[PDB]
Symmetry: C2
Subunit: 170 residues, 2 copies
């Protein structure tokens, strides 16, 4: 197995292009209420999970929810792309605020995989361009993650590694 | 039927004792995303919709989601007991902030009706004094609702009346 160790209380930040398998993975490994997704929050504020114009409002809600969960000592997983340092920054700050370990889980997959998964989605397929951009942003992000403040940085380099993941707590 | 007319830009506040059929009613009449419930918010912040220790955080979250929705011009229904004036006040204020009409839908049913439904619930049952207290607080609330800032006050007086409700946009 690919064992990924996390404290019983931590902020797990999933990092991956659209189509890399973040939501599927989060559902496999965590309780439904431990996962806050940006899609879900777009739905909460707008009725429409695919409404790209309510991003700011959705993340405000996501951030505030994360804040409450850490305040109360609840393990939390952020299901969003998180490929831009600017998106990760507030999460680290929140985890810092509540003295919680931020943990990076990176879906470092070949663009080609995300593109073909995207091609076969039945919900919201994105433009190829989006995944080209996300993937390159992800690639430029890996090096600096530890310095950004992530206490553990876990990089998954193939679907075979992702599939063999097991989280050990403590 | 019993037609309740609301504008497209409404904050619909359900007001009813535990066991009065608020959540059931909300699911029947509104889109899933239109309904924000205190139970659901308890789950968001605690993993547990029945967790009574997290009230402050849950209602903080509910109020924030409400404000974001009304700011975006999205109809919203608050699914919480709402029998205390102090509960209703922050909701009214948020609605006014974004030029939204606060609408009260009141489940003015006999205590016995809720007590009986309560004993049959599978999700979580409350002690009898809870429903007795809610019903008395509700009955004491009715007269003053319009004055509190609700633009339309709809009082439903029996399970028959509740069952016959149809919402019409005003719009
Ligand atoms: N391990 C996997 N192998 C093959 N297909 C997958 C895998 N994980 C997810 N998918 C599929 O790829 C698409 C993207 O998955 P999803 O979890 O929605 O990714 P994301 O949340 O990162 O956009 C979905 O159609 C999903 O069913
Ligand atoms: N019209 C009705 N007749 C009989 N039982 C009902 C009716 N509406 C709701 N119930 C039941 O009563 C219980 C309380 O309903 P619910 O909508 O959860 O109330 P609340 O949300 O106000 O606590 C549930 O078990 C529900 O199935
Ligand atoms: Mg997803
Ligand atoms: Mg309910």
């Amino acid at each position: 197995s690919m064992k990924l160790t996390i404290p019983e209380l931590s902020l797990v930040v999933l990092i991956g292009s659209s189509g890399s398998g973040k939501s599927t993975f989060a559902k496999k490994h965590f309780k439904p209420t431990e996962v806050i997704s940006s899609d879900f929050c777009r739905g909460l504020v707008s009725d429409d999970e695919n409404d790209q114009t309510v991003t700011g409002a959705a993340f405000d809600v996501l951030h505030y929810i994360v804040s409450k969960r850490l305040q109360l000592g609840k393990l939390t997983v952020v299901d969003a792309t998180n490929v831009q340092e600017s998106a990760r920054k507030p999460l680290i700050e929140i985890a810092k605020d509540y003295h919680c370990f931020p943990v990076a889980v990176v879906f470092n997959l070949p663009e080609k995989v995300c593109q073909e998964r995207n091609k076969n989605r039945t919900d919201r397929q994105v433009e190829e361009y989006v995944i080209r951009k996300h993937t390159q942003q992800l690639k430029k992000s890996i090096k600096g993650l530890q310095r950004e403040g992530f206490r553990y940085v876990y990089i998954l380099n193939s679907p075979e590694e992702v599939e063999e993941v097991v989280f050990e707590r403590q």
